[PDB]
Design a protein around this ligand. Structure first.
Ligand SMILES: [Co+2]
Ligand SMILES: [Co+2]
Ligand SMILES: [Co+2]
Ligand SMILES: [Co+2]
Ligand SMILES: [Co+2]
Ligand SMILES: [Co+2]
Ligand SMILES: [Co+2]
Ligand SMILES: [Co+2]
Ligand SMILES: [Co+2]
Ligand SMILES: [Co+2]
Ligand SMILES: [Co+2]
Ligand SMILES: [Co+2]
Ligand SMILES: [Co+2]
Lengths: 252, 252, 252, 252
């Protein structure tokens, strides 16, 4: 397995960036997974944005805290290769994991949500322990959608030797810390966002600026402009993690 | 000028990293600044921590949230080139800024602390406005000690054209987004930590994992092991920001 | 001067409860102040809800975090006896305080917002310092809209001997701790909510239950039912705070 | 059955109030339960603290967030009738429930901890469902130690008709809202704390005021002075919750 992991797809520039560049590189990977938490004009996922991702070559789409902004998501969750955080409570729509099959090899993908500085949910560590006991595969990729670097690092060491790779998202800025932990698991704190960086985490500068300055609510406004494609490549060969490499593409 | 900014010096490994390597590249810079908020066994700063950094070639040390862990910091704040967050309220020991002087040129260094997911402090945006209104220099470097990426980015844009460069700390992971904002101000979300990465943000893996698994307090133990020196180089010339470059060195 | 303070007016039952009962006891007071943060269907204040409050016999209306929920508030803020939290940043619409005149005697009303478990606003302690320094009156009433009971008690003690009384809001639950501080200042942790208690914090029980059980988004729905009028009577005389008495009236 | 539930015993004063008064009214109740997470100098519980509580007439002691401040607590958790929140992770020391018995009738007492504005723990709602299936008793008393009133109420309604009574703690201020829910379950937002009220939630006024003004750490210090004994009387007859009444005692 040759896997491409694509950093948070941010609003219209992000979706455009994927649609435009993925086709030119899809051939380089066996499987492509992407976080599409903000794919629907910045907030969530809808049928349209899902389609453009799939049509661009994405095989599986993960969500996050915004996983419920749009109704259409519930249809995507029951019949499409779309997953939400594993560690929502029982009775939650959709699945918290997915099994990808390619070339006779299997890859178990799992997204989990951190709890520090975020909403209360089930314990990510033990939810992972249980899952990994019931679902076996050639490779296991765990995406940790969290705010705290310590929580992301805690989960990764905890997963060392069990997961083939642990990639973080949510923070929107790509980190220069791609490495392999003592027991072999690959790791990166944040993949980064795929969208226009001529903004503040996807939103229009002055909008966010107005929030910090006035202390008064300011409706989200997706920024528009040239985008950056952010992703991380994972090389899984012979049931063992081989290499991890961040990837960047600047839209012309 | 040519300035080197060194990412949070974390406990004994971080201190060794600076003492062992800084001497070797010291002559390539006019000014060397370092965040020493975790220099003392991972918590705050004390006289020994301070002397070591100085002996290595550090010209100025900044703090943050752990600034008040050791009473020895007061003497330091009182008569040494050590600074604390500008945006503490009136009646706070020490200074929140420092105007360095070298070969006839001046560099105003200021550290502000974010408020999102952190303690309630004064408005850093307007705190900076008041300072920059009365304090002038050839160049200005602002360190933003904050948790949220949106807050660091908001502060950078808000200072764009006024500050020569804006660097983020507190996260402990180097980000790959060193760039030049519209009005010329250089920026990087997080310089990264200086210390052993065989840990959880400098803390012993076993210790942090226990906190996360049990939800019960666990006294902080500083991880020990090979270190990584993390810094960011800045080039200011002709009264303008020329370049910004993430720097790394692995301890043999 | 005999003052009535009315606990958070919650959505339609709250507006009703006041419109019904206040006219029957208005005689008993010289001045009446109300928190209308949740007046307009539980979220904010607008022309209609405001008008209903004045007609019921309210002389001044205060808000809080939900102040900006309806843009109709702005007009109200610049021409009507409506005040928002004092500690918002410079340039914030509306006044942070208001002077009430009743038979020669003057009453300075001030609303302050806590920062613990809330948003990063200006320092409320020093904010009051600057105000009470440049604004005098026979009596001073400070409302503390905050979440943490420690912050309310600290603000109260800090104002002891300065404010005639300090009353807390935001909790939506009446507290039984009305008393006199060491230096005379009257105090109660939370006045209580004015609206239907057949709900959770004024919202439908089911909606809120769904939020805690699913961890997923649930739009706010104002509960309906018998209202329970909550307020606190303040007796200031001879320039000195004499009494404080919580008041309750259940809708028949 | 007549049960007396004492509010959080705060340090020396609180501990004194219980020892002096409880022996006087002890005969007026069948079971006496007390929150003692602040009994030992305002920081957790210990042998001395526990002995004094038992010798005072307390049959069971509950804990909370500070349950782990003292090493001696673990031994108490193993043999003595002391409980910590049920909603900690599996493998946690001690129990989160306790079966009391008095002449034929049985009482299941449970303590859960809220999560809003607090630490990440297991889902208290579903934790209660599971416990209530395996543990049955004539009456059930659930203590909700939390910050958010909305969470305490949501839990109360979730237990309505299932729990005999639901009492909240952690806020340190008695609420005037004791009542009966639609399905008979008795409820009160906060029993209030037992200790000297001439302080900010049990702590020295000056100390807490210093924290709020400086924004710098100040070691906790328990206030000393005349105490207020806060509790709530519960009456369970014919297999249903009959009466709930707040209870106060000013120290001579
Ligand atoms: Co490991
Ligand atoms: Co997110
Ligand atoms: Co991201
Ligand atoms: Co290429
Ligand atoms: Co070199
Ligand atoms: Co700009
Ligand atoms: Co820090
Ligand atoms: Co009447
Ligand atoms: Co005082
Ligand atoms: Co409010
Ligand atoms: Co019910
Ligand atoms: Co507590
Ligand atoms: Co309490």
């Amino acid at each position: 397995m040759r896997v491409l992991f694509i950093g948070d797809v941010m609003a219209e520039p992000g979706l455009r960036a994927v649609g435009l560049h993925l086709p030119d590189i899809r051939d380089r990977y066996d499987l492509v997974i992407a976080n599409g938490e903000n794919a629907a004009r910045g907030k969530g996922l809808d049928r349209r944005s899902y389609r453009l991702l799939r049509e661009a070559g994405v095989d599986l789409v993960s969500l996050g805290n915004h996983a419920w902004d749009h109704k259409e998501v519930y249809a995507l969750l029951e019949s499409e290769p779309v997953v939400r955080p594993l560690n929502y409570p029982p009775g939650t729509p959709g699945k918290g994991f997915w099994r990808l099959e390619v070339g006779g090899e299997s890859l178990l993908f799992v997204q989990v949500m951190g709890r520090i500085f975020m909403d209360p949910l089930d314990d990510p560590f033990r939810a992972l322990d249980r899952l990994l006991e019931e679902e076996k595969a050639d490779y296991v990729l765990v995406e940790v959608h969290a705010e705290a670097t310590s929580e992301k690092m805690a989960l990764a060491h905890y997963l060392d030797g069990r997961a083939s790779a642990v990639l973080g998202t949510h923070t929107h800025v790509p980190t220069l810390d791609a490495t392999r932990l003592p027991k072999g698991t690959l790791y990166q704190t944040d993949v980064g966002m795929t969208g226009t960086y001529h903004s503040i985490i996807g939103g229009e500068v002055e909008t966010f600026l107005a929030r910090f300055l006035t202390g008064r609510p300011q409706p989200f406004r997706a920024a528009q402009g040239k985008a950056r494609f952010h992703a991380t490549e994972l090389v899984f060969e012979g049931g063992r993690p081989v290499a991890i490499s961040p990837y960047v593409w600047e839209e012309p």
